Design a protein around this motif. Structure first.
Motif, short mmCIF file in Angstrom:
data_model
loop_
_atom_site.label_atom_id
_atom_site.label_comp_id
_atom_site.label_asym_id
_atom_site.label_seq_id
_atom_site.Cartn_x
_atom_site.Cartn_y
_atom_site.Cartn_z
N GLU A 37 0.84 -1.44 -0.23
CA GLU A 37 0.30 -0.34 0.18
C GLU A 37 0.73 1.03 -0.19
O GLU A 37 0.38 2.47 -0.76
N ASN A 38 1.75 1.27 0.75
CA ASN A 38 2.58 2.36 0.69
C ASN A 38 3.81 2.91 -0.78
O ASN A 38 3.13 3.34 -1.13
N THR A 39 3.83 1.66 -0.78
CA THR A 39 4.58 1.65 -2.21
C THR A 39 3.87 2.12 -3.67
O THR A 39 4.27 3.16 -4.57
N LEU A 40 2.94 1.81 -3.19
CA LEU A 40 1.72 2.27 -4.30
C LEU A 40 1.40 3.12 -3.92
O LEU A 40 0.90 4.35 -5.27
N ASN A 41 1.12 4.12 -2.78
CA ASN A 41 0.84 5.87 -2.74
C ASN A 41 2.42 5.99 -2.92
O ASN A 41 1.15 7.28 -4.04
N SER A 42 3.08 6.20 -3.50
CA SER A 42 4.67 6.45 -3.90
C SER A 42 4.47 6.61 -5.19
O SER A 42 4.76 7.71 -5.51
N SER A 43 4.16 5.22 -5.36
CA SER A 43 3.65 5.77 -7.00
C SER A 43 3.18 6.62 -7.11
O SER A 43 2.67 7.16 -9.06
N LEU A 44 1.89 6.93 -7.32
CA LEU A 44 0.69 7.58 -7.83
C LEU A 44 1.74 9.17 -7.50
O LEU A 44 1.50 9.89 -8.53
N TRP A 45 1.96 9.25 -6.09
CA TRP A 45 2.79 10.85 -6.23
C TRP A 45 3.87 10.77 -7.16
O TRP A 45 3.82 12.52 -7.39
N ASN A 46 4.87 10.06 -6.86
CA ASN A 46 5.35 10.40 -8.04
C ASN A 46 5.10 9.81 -9.69
O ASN A 46 6.43 9.62 -10.44
N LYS A 47 3.99 9.44 -9.94
CA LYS A 47 3.52 10.07 -11.06
C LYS A 47 4.26 8.15 -12.05
O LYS A 47 4.53 9.03 -13.09
C1 LIG Z 1 1.22 9.23 0.01
O1 LIG Z 1 2.52 9.95 -0.80
C2 LIG Z 1 2.61 11.66 -0.14
C3 LIG Z 1 3.13 11.95 -0.59
O2 LIG Z 1 4.64 11.84 0.39
C4 LIG Z 1 5.65 12.06 -0.56
O3 LIG Z 1 6.29 11.46 -1.41
C5 LIG Z 1 5.82 10.47 -1.63
C6 LIG Z 1 6.36 10.51 -3.22
C7 LIG Z 1 7.62 10.04 -1.20
O4 LIG Z 1 8.88 10.81 -1.88
C8 LIG Z 1 7.48 9.92 0.28
O5 LIG Z 1 8.69 10.00 0.80
C9 LIG Z 1 6.84 11.43 0.98
O6 LIG Z 1 6.68 11.65 1.94
C10 LIG Z 1 1.86 11.38 1.55
O7 LIG Z 1 1.88 12.74 2.26
C11 LIG Z 1 3.50 12.96 2.87
O8 LIG Z 1 3.42 12.59 4.38
C12 LIG Z 1 4.45 13.46 4.96
C13 LIG Z 1 4.78 12.54 6.35
O9 LIG Z 1 5.28 10.60 6.00
C14 LIG Z 1 4.44 14.59 5.54
O10 LIG Z 1 5.65 15.66 5.94
C15 LIG Z 1 4.26 15.20 3.80
O11 LIG Z 1 4.17 16.85 3.76
C16 LIG Z 1 3.20 14.89 2.82
N1 LIG Z 1 2.92 15.47 1.61
C17 LIG Z 1 1.69 16.13 1.25
C18 LIG Z 1 2.15 16.41 -0.06
O12 LIG Z 1 0.48 15.28 1.99
C19 LIG Z 1 1.48 10.60 2.06
O13 LIG Z 1 1.22 10.77 3.86
C20 LIG Z 1 1.19 9.14 1.78
N2 LIG Z 1 0.02 8.70 2.17
C21 LIG Z 1 -0.33 7.10 2.56
C22 LIG Z 1 -1.79 7.27 3.55
O14 LIG Z 1 0.72 6.34 2.87
#
Ligand SMILES: *[C@@H]1O[C@H](CO[C@@H]2O[C@@H](C)[C@@H](O)[C@@H](O)[C@@H]2O)[C@@H](O[C@@H]2O[C@H](CO)[C@@H](O)[C@H](O)[C@H]2NC(C)=O)[C@H](O)[C@H]1NC(C)=O
Ligand SMILES: *[C@@H]1O[C@H](CO)[C@@H](O[C@@H]2O[C@H](CO)[C@@H](O)[C@H](O)[C@H]2NC(C)=O)[C@H](O)[C@H]1NC(C)=O
Ligand SMILES: *[C@@H]1O[C@H](CO)[C@@H](O[C@@H]2O[C@H](CO)[C@@H](O)[C@H](O)[C@H]2NC(C)=O)[C@H](O)[C@H]1NC(C)=O
Ligand SMILES: *[C@@H]1O[C@H](CO)[C@@H](O)[C@H](O)[C@H]1NC(C)=O
Ligand SMILES: *[C@@H]1O[C@H](CO)[C@@H](O)[C@H](O)[C@H]1NC(C)=O
Ligand SMILES: [Zn+2]
Ligand SMILES: [Zn+2]
Length: 423
Positions: free
Chosen positions: A209-219
């Motif tokens: 779940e955490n890996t997929l979340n990061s992939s989403l936000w990293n496009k």
């Molecule tokens: C889902 O991911 C977001 C994005 O987090 C960042 O982006 C990723 C691509 C990766 O590089 C991560 O290491 C980064 O942290 C998370 O949002 C961040 O959460 C941190 C706390 O962990 C916070 O300090 C940041 O401000 C948040 N950034 C944003 C844009 O909201 C989010 O927590 C993740 N969600 C889950 C459910 O895991």
């Protein structure tokens, strides 16, 4: 404008998928056919030759022929996925931790020696452990050994999770914006007595779940690879490939992230199967590709088996949508008779089935066709399911319903509904 990247003068990316090599280092042609291969467990090999026998696992000569075919094929490929199961089917006491590591090392080094510049993404199979199937939820000698073996292909973070739990994710060096997630689905496989009743073995669901979340936000786009697939075994009634509790949990994650996941690729079944992951209301979300084995092995009683196979996928560069799949195979009887291999095209998926691409919609519509009475499309699929081993193999009404239901309905509720309606 100066110092701008040079524009091209319709490009297609490609990658290979190999699985279930099951090397039997004991294989040799001998007059006493109960001594050809330990993987026949004392049965006479049926009609053995240099490339193997249906009652044996793979001779080294067969495996090398598959990789030499890939090397010499004229196909460009930017990476390869390799979904596990390297040691042979012999009884537990005929193997050991060291023997398992020796076989995986042999296969790994065969690949690294022949393809020094190609990034490969392995996943562990249920036989890639001693004793087989008992893959643990903490670090182990095997996990550490494969972390060392696969280090050329994997970064620090991937090595860390692989050593700990047998899974990892890794950026594809040659494909910016694509990540491979290599799951250890053997943690969810029924015979694994090390994981019984655990809600999240090795914390892989939380990690996924955490890996997929990061992939989403990293496009990024993601390809999922693993040994044992999700969904239901298509030749059996109501028998999920991994335990139901885990199948449901994994599919819930995949549905939610189906817009980030551009492909799912599995082995273990030793058959060529499709699945289409849909939501509860039948909206198709994700295409799933189970690849057939290199080994042709079967049990003494089993009526059919597969020819050896390897396959190639085509995808849109920089976007990673799947465009096609080319399945290659070895006609084992033909190769054994003359003593030389002819790895050759079995089919191109778009041509075989007259579909536009491998997107969920395209396959979902194809499987509607399969379900129609006397569908020629399904008849072809059933022929390809065994990698063209036996054109006279038939699939009666009950057999077909089990197949089509398993293709379309990966979760228990949908699967059960399909059987209630059609069986
Ligand atoms: C889902 O991911 C977001 C994005 O987090 C960042 O982006 C990723 C691509 C990766 O590089 C991560 O290491 C980064 O942290 C998370 O949002 C961040 O959460 C941190 C706390 O962990 C916070 O300090 C940041 O401000 C948040 N950034 C944003 C844009 O909201 C989010 O927590 C993740 N969600 C889950 C459910 O895991
Ligand atoms: C992997 O194992 C095979 C044999 O189990 C090794 O191959 C030996 O030598 C040639 C090719 O090197 C094979 O065709 C023979 O079958 C093997 N010899 C004997 C006596 O069986 C191969 O070298 C090994 N590869 C690695 C990297 O360890
Ligand atoms: C693989 O090769 C074998 C051996 O050449 C093929 O066997 C043929 O099988 C058909 C029935 O399916 C027979 O009627 C032919 O006489 C066989 N040919 C020979 C030369 O023996 C087999 O068909 C091949 N498999 C595929 C998928 O083409
Ligand atoms: C294997 O085949 C030979 C026939 O050539 C036979 O004599 C022998 O008993 C067979 N053994 C088994 C276990 O089938
Ligand atoms: C563990 O067992 C209990 C009862 O046997 C069951 O209710 C629970 O769902 C099980 N958990 C898993 C993860 O299988
Ligand atoms: Zn296997
Ligand atoms: Zn397996």
């Amino acid at each position: 404008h100066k110092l701008v990247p040079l524009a091209p003068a319709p490009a297609v990316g490609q990658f290979w998928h190999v699985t279930d090599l099951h090397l039997d280092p004991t294989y040799h042609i001998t007059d006493d056919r109960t001594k050809v291969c330990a993987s026949s467990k004392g049965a006479n090999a049926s009609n053995p030759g240099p490339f193997g026998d249906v009652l044996c696992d793979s001779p080294y000569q067969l495996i090398l022929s598959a990789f030499d075919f890939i090397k010499n094929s004229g196909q460009e490929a930017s990476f390869m996925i390799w979904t596990g199961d390297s040691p042979p089917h012999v009884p537990v006491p005929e193997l050991s931790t060291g023997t398992v590591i020796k076989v995986i090392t042999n296969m790994t080094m065969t690949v690294q020696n022949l393809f020094p510049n190609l990034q490969v993404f392995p996943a562990l199979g249920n036989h890639d452990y001693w004793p087989q199937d008992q893959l643990p939820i903490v670090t182990s000698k095997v996990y550490s050994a494969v972390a060392d073996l696969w280090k050329p292909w994997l970064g620090e973070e991937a090595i860390s999770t692989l050593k700990k739990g047998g899974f990892y994710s890794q950026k594809v060096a040659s494909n910016p914006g694509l990540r491979i997630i290599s799951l250890n689905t053997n943690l969810y496989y029924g015979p694994n007595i090390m994981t019984l009743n655990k809600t999240d073995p090795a914390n892989q669901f939380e990690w996924l779940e955490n890996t997929l979340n990061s992939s989403l936000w990293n496009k990024e786009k993601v390809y999922i690879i693993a040994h044992v697939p999700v969904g239901y075994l298509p030749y059996a009634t109501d028998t999920p490939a991994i335990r139901q509790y885990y199948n449901e949990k994994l599919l819930d994650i995949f549905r939610r992230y189906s817009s980030v996941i551009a492909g799912q690729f599995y082995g273990h079944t030793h058959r060529d199967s499709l699945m289409v992951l849909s939501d509860k209301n039948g909206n198709p979300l994700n295409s799933v590709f189970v690849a057939p084995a290199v080994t042709p092995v079967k049990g003494v009683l089993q009526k059919e088996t597969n020819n050896p196979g390897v396959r190639l996928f085509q995808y849109k560069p920089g976007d990673y949508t799947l465009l096609d799949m080319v399945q290659y195979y070895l006609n084992l009887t033909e190769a054994n008779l003359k003593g030389e291999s002819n790895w050759t095209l079995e089919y191109v998926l778009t041509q075989a089935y007259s579909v536009a691409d491998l997107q969920p919609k395209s396959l979902y519509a194809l499987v509607q066709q399969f379900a129609t009475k006397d569908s020629k499309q399904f008849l072809k699929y059933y022929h390809y399911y065994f990698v063209s081993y036996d054109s006279s193999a038939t699939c009666d009404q009950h057999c077909k319903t089990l197949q089509v239901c398993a293709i379309m309905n990966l979760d228990s509720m949908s699967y059960d509904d399909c059987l209630k309606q059609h069986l």
